């Protein structure tokens, strides 16, 4: 038994956030909702479908009907930016939804500046190749980076890291590193990271051909 949440919800301040959570046996059992901000433990905001714990603002409300549970936030504010998880019990076991990232757009969107770095010759000597894709100073935080090698999607060999929000312009940066063996790296020509972001009308691709100078 699994609970399905939307990966991301984006709205503007004051608007009403709607976060859904679906499951076959939901009307059988109660649903709880948790808020989690970066570096902190989850916080219970709704329990038993509709109940607010003490100290939770009244703008948080819940409902559960037709195998769909919904978390609603009226007059969404900046402090509401967080990840939200639904949770239920199927008989004995607890199940969590995948989580919904709630973004409240406080300033204009800024597309990322994208840079790509081939592996250094020094690293290639060591028998490994790291390709780095840098997304710089973008807003909001949600961004997708995917690797293509000779137009073949790469899965399971890349990792991402993101900075904390800049104190001043409130932007983020993100790195994606693709790691291959030297051998595998030398078997292909075109290395590309495809970037999507709400500030981009269409995907952006930064690429190079192994050996460009």
């Amino acid at each position: 038994y699994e609970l399905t949440q939307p990966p991301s919800v984006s709205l503007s301040p004051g608007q009403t956030a709607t976060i859904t959570c679906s499951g076959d046996k939901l009307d059988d059992n109660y649903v709880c909702w948790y808020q989690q901000k970066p570096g902190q433990s989850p916080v219970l905001v709704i329990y038993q479908d509709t109940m607010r714990p003490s100290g939770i603002p009244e703008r948080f409300s819940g409902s559960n009907s037709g195998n769909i549970a919904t978390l609603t936030i009226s007059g969404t504010q900046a402090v509401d930016e967080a990840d939200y998880y639904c949770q239920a019990w199927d008989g004995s076991t607890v199940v969590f939804g995948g989580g919904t990232r709630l973004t409240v757009l406080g300033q204009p969107k800024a597309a990322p500046s994208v840079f790509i770095f081939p592996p250094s010759d020094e690293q290639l000597k060591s028998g490994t190749a790291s390709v780095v894709c840098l997304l710089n100073n973008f807003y909001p935080r949600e961004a997708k980076v995917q690797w293509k090698v000779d137009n073949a999607l790469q899965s399971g060999n890349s990792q991402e890291s993101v900075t904390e929000q800049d104190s001043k312009d409130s932007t983020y940066s993100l790195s994606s590193t693709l790691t291959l063996s030297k051998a595998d790296y030398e078997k292909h020509k075109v290395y590309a990271c495809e970037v999507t972001h709400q500030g981009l009308s269409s995907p952006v691709t930064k690429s190079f051909n192994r050996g460009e100078c």
Partner: protein, 222 residues
């Protein structure tokens, strides 16, 4: 009064076990169930099982059958979760959280979490590779360059540029734990493209656990 407090961070090799402590108040110990929930970097919450400390009854999630052991010590109102046969995928923050027990009030109080890092690695200093500025890292009048600080263990590492003289436009990313069990991170900086021929750029890396100190000059790709 704090209701739940967990033990400190753990580092374990694959195949070993890790025992996380969760000391509770008397009120929590006597009137709540304790849930155990873990969360890996950038991933969601995953429930492992529950214990009622007053009675000692427990339940586990099927995925963790045989591998998890929940125990208690009444005299010090503490509960424990031991995870055995650790693997790389078990690296995560492990939480205890209390709940009153349809009849579920949710987990209304959480411990601070216990980081468990599963790695076969011994202490190891990083290799430092240049992220050279080129036409492929030039956006108009701005150029990007950096240093890849790869394959070190354990945390942490610090990076500066030009011995601390260059701070504007520097982004030093949080490390990731690779499937090898070693950490890797990058430190980048954006600078005027016109400065590449005249300005020297050196990243200063210090991995104190291995006493590794590296200054790497980053030059444009020719």
């Amino acid at each position: 009064q704090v209701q739940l407090v967990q033990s400190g961070a753990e580092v374990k090799k694959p195949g070993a076990s890790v025992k996380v402590s969760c000391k509770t108040s008397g009120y929590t110990f006597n009137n709540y169930d304790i849930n155990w929930v873990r969360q890996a970097a950038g991933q969601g919450l995953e429930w492992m099982g529950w214990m009622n400390p007053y009675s000692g009854n427990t339940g586990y999630a099927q995925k963790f059958q045989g591998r998890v052991t929940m125990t208690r010590n009444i005299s010090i109102t503490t509960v424990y979760m031991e995870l055995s046969s650790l693997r790389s995928e078990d690296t995560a923050v492990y939480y205890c959280a209390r709940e009153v027990r349809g009849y579920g009030g949710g987990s209304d109080y959480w411990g601070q979490g216990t980081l468990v890092t599963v790695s076969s690695a011994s202490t190891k200093g990083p290799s430092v590779f240049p992220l050279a500025p080129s036409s492929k890292s030039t956006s108009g009048g701005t150029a990007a360059l950096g240093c890849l600080v790869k394959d070190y263990f354990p945390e942490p590492v610090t990076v500066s540029w030009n011995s601390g003289a260059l701070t504007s436009g520097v982004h030093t990313f949080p490390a990731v734990l690779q499937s090898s069990g070693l950490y890797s991170l990058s430190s980048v900086v954006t600078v005027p493209s016109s400065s590449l021929g005249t300005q020297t750029y050196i990243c200063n890396v210090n991995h104190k656990p291995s006493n590794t100190k590296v200054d790497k000059r980053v030059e444009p790709k020719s």
